């Protein structure tokens, strides 16, 4: 799983 | 932000 918070 | 992968 991937979560990216820019 | 929230991501939960059960
Ligand atoms: Zn930011
Ligand atoms: Zn699972």
UniProtKB/Swiss-Prot annotation, chains A, B:
Subcellular location per the Swiss-Prot or TrEMBL entry: Cytoplasm
Source superkingdom: Eukaryota
Further comment: [PSI+] is the prion form of SUP35. [PSI+] is the result of a conformational change of the cellular SUP35 protein that becomes self-propagating and infectious. This conformational change generates a form of SUP35 that assembles into amyloid fibrils. [PSI+]-aggregates sequester soluble SUP35, resulting in defects in faithful translation termination by read-through of translation termination codons. [PSI+] can be cured by GdnHCl and by deletion of the molecular chaperone HSP104, which is required for [PSI+] propagation.
Record note on domains: The prion domain (PrD) is a Gln/Asn (Q/N)-rich domain, which is unstructured in its native, soluble form, and which forms a parallel in-register beta-sheet in its amyloid form.
Membership in a protein family: Belongs to the TRAFAC class translation factor GTPase superfamily. Classic translation factor GTPase family. ERF3 subfamily.
Role summary: GTPase component of the eRF1-eRF3-GTP ternary complex, a ternary complex that mediates translation termination in response to the termination codons UAA, UAG and UGA. SUP35/eRF3 mediates SUP45/eRF1 delivery to stop codons: The eRF1-eRF3-GTP complex binds to a stop codon in the ribosomal A-site. GTP hydrolysis by SUP35/eRF3 induces a conformational change that leads to its dissociation, permitting SUP45/eRF1 to accommodate fully in the A-site. Recruited by polyadenylate-binding protein PAB1 to poly(A)-tails of mRNAs.
Self-association state and partner proteins as the record states: Heterodimer of two subunits, one of which binds GTP. Interacts with polyadenylate-binding protein PAB1, and TPA1.
Protein name in the entry: Eukaryotic peptide chain release factor GTP-binding subunit
Residue window of the full protein shown: 8 to 13 of 685
